[PDB]
Design an enzyme around this catalytic site. Structure first.
Site, mmCIF file in Angstrom:
data_model
loop_
_atom_site.group_PDB
_atom_site.id
_atom_site.type_symbol
_atom_site.label_atom_id
_atom_site.label_comp_id
_atom_site.label_asym_id
_atom_site.label_seq_id
_atom_site.Cartn_x
_atom_site.Cartn_y
_atom_site.Cartn_z
ATOM 1 N N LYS A 45 5.477 4.565 5.025
ATOM 2 C CA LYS A 45 6.085 3.563 4.139
ATOM 3 C C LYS A 45 6.384 4.132 2.744
ATOM 4 O O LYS A 45 7.408 3.821 2.154
ATOM 5 C CB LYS A 45 5.155 2.362 3.986
ATOM 6 N N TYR A 105 0.823 -1.200 0.000
ATOM 7 C CA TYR A 105 0.000 0.000 0.000
ATOM 8 C C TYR A 105 0.868 1.266 0.000
ATOM 9 O O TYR A 105 0.329 2.368 -0.084
ATOM 10 C CB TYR A 105 -1.027 0.014 1.151
#
Lengths: 248, 249, 241, 248
Positions: free
Chosen positions: C158, C143
């Site tokens: 991330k 994601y």
């Protein structure tokens, strides 16, 4: 009007998105050339969108045939004397498991979508190069062009190829000739053909509805405007957020 | 119509921010511009305002959540609505990754990533409570989805902002009908940062052979906020003349 | 050459971190595992250590630049080198974006993004001073390059890490010959509609993930730099047309 | 399941990367089938790579011909009785400005690279489906497949199509048959012969050197190993960081 004196070619312009784009360009006063494989649909489309006599030129042709393309270019040049915008929309799509797809079925989609888009683009580009015209090309792609397209492997491959061609031409021709090349990737749009209820995918769209041919036409119009002159080599997605991950 | 709308532009006193403010104001919207320095805010207001009180200047810091709530209250009291949020406030400069100070890294992450989150969440909650179908536009950069050598701080922050953009487009698009998108500009004149061999070379790097303009950027943001664009959600619109693409095989 | 290498794995006392630590120790490297709680580190150590003094546990916080320098000093004193850094320390949970507290958002950005940067810069500088051609592996998520509904904090963090990975691969790959890559795991072992969502029809394993990290650190993989290797059975791809 | 018992097909296996991959799989004990259009190159590669008599099967065939493909599967099945891995490597590439590319030139690249990869993958997949074999497919792509490929528009389009196919089959066949499909995108590799100074190229690679066929072979071997069983539908790039932006 606003687009007066511009000539726009829309392959596959007699139905669906093609005709929605065709409607908008004609309303803005541009000359519009729409192509298709059937005489009757072209005549109907022309009657629906023409704002003044001689505004629309219908051409029954096959984007897979390079002679047809050259004949169309000569016909447009004689009638209007110029070509400003090419929209590669002609497409063919249906669902079929990859293992069950016939070789002719695969070939037909690659030929119409990928090869036909290249044949139209190169021939129109060569016309612009010779006339010193800073043209605009818009290629209709799909959000599965940069991901997986289960059940539509033929279209996913062909449209991926079109997206790569879009970016490659934007670099080469943007630099050498000032020709802009971009793509549009639409989500599910109302009033379009194809092959347990719809709410199954309207639900998959964050905005919870289908897009419209008029909205797609507005994006195409913006991309062709003077304001958008610096947009080049991109794909503008209009899908209400559908192609994004919907859960973690 | 745009005439009745209220647009917030963070970092709106100079560069792209001011270019966007200029366009929304000419179209008749009320525009709220934010910034850290009073002088620049008053200069920008004078330059872009079409009529008395059309522009509201707010001296604040996007890293301060108390500043954000004060601003929302002030806007609500004065205009009674907020329709559009453009997260533009940014900070940038070149520095090799191994030489960047912890404070330098932190400052860019805080202003760009955290500040965009603080503003977006506060405005989103205001929209949620009032049932407003808002629109958010985040300014990113083309290095946000690739490598940003020499600007690792901004590359990381802007990549975070792009992820946030897509995430809110899904969550809020679905639950509240709020649209969230991003714009990735290429090199734009009249927007120089801090940091000619490489100068003319970078123009050579743009297939179209020129820099973009703040007015072109403003036209993209204006289109993205128009009713025609209502189905555009969770995307990043790049405007860079083709620069971010491979230029040779 | 693994026998002579020193591998640092942040968040190495449980899950994927422990799976990676287990494989590197079985291959004979010295392994340094970090974590926040003493007992979990001691349990992990007992479980993975193949010989005395193979594993060094360090109770530290990746958000603390002073803890990072102390760790580097300790490692250098005990082993005299550092070859590999795996930034795995992570924090995550589900929460609607509009409900997320400022502290909740800040803590995930701090641990995941900032912590990875603090560890990477400190280790990079150590390698730079000693002329070491190190390898960094950052643990991201699929994601990171798309939407992460319900985990916006982790998606943003991330995505930042993925950008840092590519950026350092260019800067440090060119200037120092240091390789930087990322791994994006799908659902990993240690109701079933998400199993159905994976084309391969099952969860991945920490042993498989460890095998990928091991390959990335091998001499054969020396030309791999600035890329994200995803191991998710095909899950992140569109499942329907 | 042990490599010693496996059969690996590598199209375009008589030279360059294909031969490097062939060398590694043969060295690990697999039976390897290499395809090519020239008898002499095939025999040279065989002598160079073979570890024991009968280990390598050379097949002179055209990936664009579905009859050649069908005959090859019959021959392999008769000789070896199974097929475990298919590496689609055969390719054609040269530089040509998009406006100067002949229709035949464009058609040939799309045919060999895109269509040939689909013909081989569908035929081998159907073979696996019939026999209940959970096969593994690796497609060789390039980093320009997801970007612009100026000067190589034909290969950029074809390879982009291959990448979409890779992801699409990973989903459809991963789910229905347990077949894994992945791609490899190499950067510049020494000893590969496709049609100013070369220090410019190595300079554009952060790692400052060319990759090797042996490195590419290690990646292909890892991807076929049991520990990589969960990798599916992805593209592993091996380019020293070349495809990334090199300056702000």
């Amino acid at each position: 009007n606003a687009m007066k004196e511009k000539v726009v070619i829309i392959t596959g312009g007699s139905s669906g998105m093609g005709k929605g784009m065709a409607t908008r360009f004609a309303k803005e006063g541009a000359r519009v050339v729409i192509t298709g494989r059937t005489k009757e649909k072209l005549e109907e489309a022309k009657l629906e969108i023409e704002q003044f006599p001689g505004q629309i030129l219908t051409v029954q042709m096959d984007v897979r045939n390079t002679d047809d393309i050259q004949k169309m270019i000569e016909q447009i040049d004689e009638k209007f004397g110029r070509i400003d915008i090419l929209i590669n929309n002609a497409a063919g799509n249906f669902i079929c498991p990859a293992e069950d797809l016939s070789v002719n079925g695969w070939n037909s989609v690659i030929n119409i979508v990928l090869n036909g888009t290249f044949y139209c683009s190169q021939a129109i580009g060569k016309y612009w190069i010779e006339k010193g015209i800073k043209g605009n090309i818009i290629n209709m792609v799909a959000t599965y062009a940069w991901d997986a397209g289960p059940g539509v492997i033929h279209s996913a491959a062909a449209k991926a190829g079109v997206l790569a061609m879009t970016k490659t031409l934007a670099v080469e021709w943007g630099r050498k000739y000032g020709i802009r090349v971009n793509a549009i990737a639409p989500g599910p749009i109302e009033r379009t053909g194809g092959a347990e209820m719809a709410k199954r995918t309207i639900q998959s769209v964050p905005l919870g509805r289908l897009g419209t041919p008029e909205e797609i036409a507005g994006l195409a119009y913006y991309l062709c405007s003077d304001e958008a002159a610096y947009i080049n080599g991109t794909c503008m997605t209009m899908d209400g957020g559908q192609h994004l991950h919907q859960y973690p």
